[PDB]
Amino acid sequence: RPTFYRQELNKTIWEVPERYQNLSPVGAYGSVCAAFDTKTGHRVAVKKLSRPFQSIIHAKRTYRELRLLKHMKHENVIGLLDVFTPARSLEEFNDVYLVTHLMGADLNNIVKCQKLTDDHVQFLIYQILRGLKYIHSADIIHRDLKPSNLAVNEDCELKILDFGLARHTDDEMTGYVATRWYRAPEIMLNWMHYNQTVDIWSVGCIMAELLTGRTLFPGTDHIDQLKLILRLVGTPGAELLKKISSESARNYIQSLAQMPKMNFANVFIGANPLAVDLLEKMLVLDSDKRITAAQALAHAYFAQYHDPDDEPVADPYDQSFESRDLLIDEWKSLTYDEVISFVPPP
Ligand SMILES: Cc1n[nH]c(=O)nc1Nc1ccc(C(C)C)cc1
Ligand SMILES: [Cl-]
């Protein structure tokens, strides 16, 4: 066990190992401090979870986040540098701290403030798809891909962060909000179950924005956004309509005048024809027909970065706990076990 020291920063007590120095507050899930890690020499983000075991839903969400972060070991995905508690036994266990690499800019900071060449777009989207190939190979769905969840450094290197933990609420998705602008239309009103093709829709929305500098579907509400989407990609054809099982979806959809898919070369004026072709393969209304991450890596648009010997897959990830029903103390004890079994990376 390391030695811990205590301090109060903005009305919160932080009790952390001596290896973490120069804590500075940075920003409902918890409070975050930037710090210097004297073991690894990295600047890190230290998050103290708020009330991690207050309810069954909260205790299970704490376990979910910790299991997910412990699993991710990929250059283009946020990983777990450390996890700790000041408790010396399960019986006094109450607080959980998570440590990750500190992130400077996100893709928002860059999209708003840079002139991006086609070469910049190629490299940024290539890295998203390389990380997504890894995530999807473990049968994980991110669910919340958007520019503020992509970290980028001065060398244009990118990491995916902030996995959807089933945390976003109804009010968080209401109105003119970036929280919803990147979500696939078949899940915006829960007409279909979540599946990994929804992440590819989000990548298409991000790629379009990098190309034009503008949000692709900046809807003022769920319905306005659906209208923007259907104008670009068309209303459902007969083949897709056969597959639509939600009666709610069918009733409303059939009230809309039919529209053809638009010509993407007239929407994304001046873009590389290969980037237009890839966008057409991501932004397909029928999610069965969307390109996958593994398929997209072999698209000609990435010819200068694609290396099939350096695009690795993940160890299998056991998610059986998601269908399990336990008490608070049992979720809490499973979380304690994962804290004390953590082994740092090399
Ligand atoms: C592919 C698919 N499979 N099953 C289903 O129930 N619904 C599906 N797609 C679907 C596509 C679009 C829409 C709205 C956005 C027009 C709804 C369902
Ligand atoms: Cl220490």
Ligand SMILES: [Cl-]
């Ligand atoms: Cl504690």
Ligand SMILES: [Cl-]
């Ligand atoms: Cl965002």
Ligand SMILES: [Cl-]
């Ligand atoms: Cl596992």
Ligand SMILES: [Mg+2]
């Ligand atoms: Mg975020």
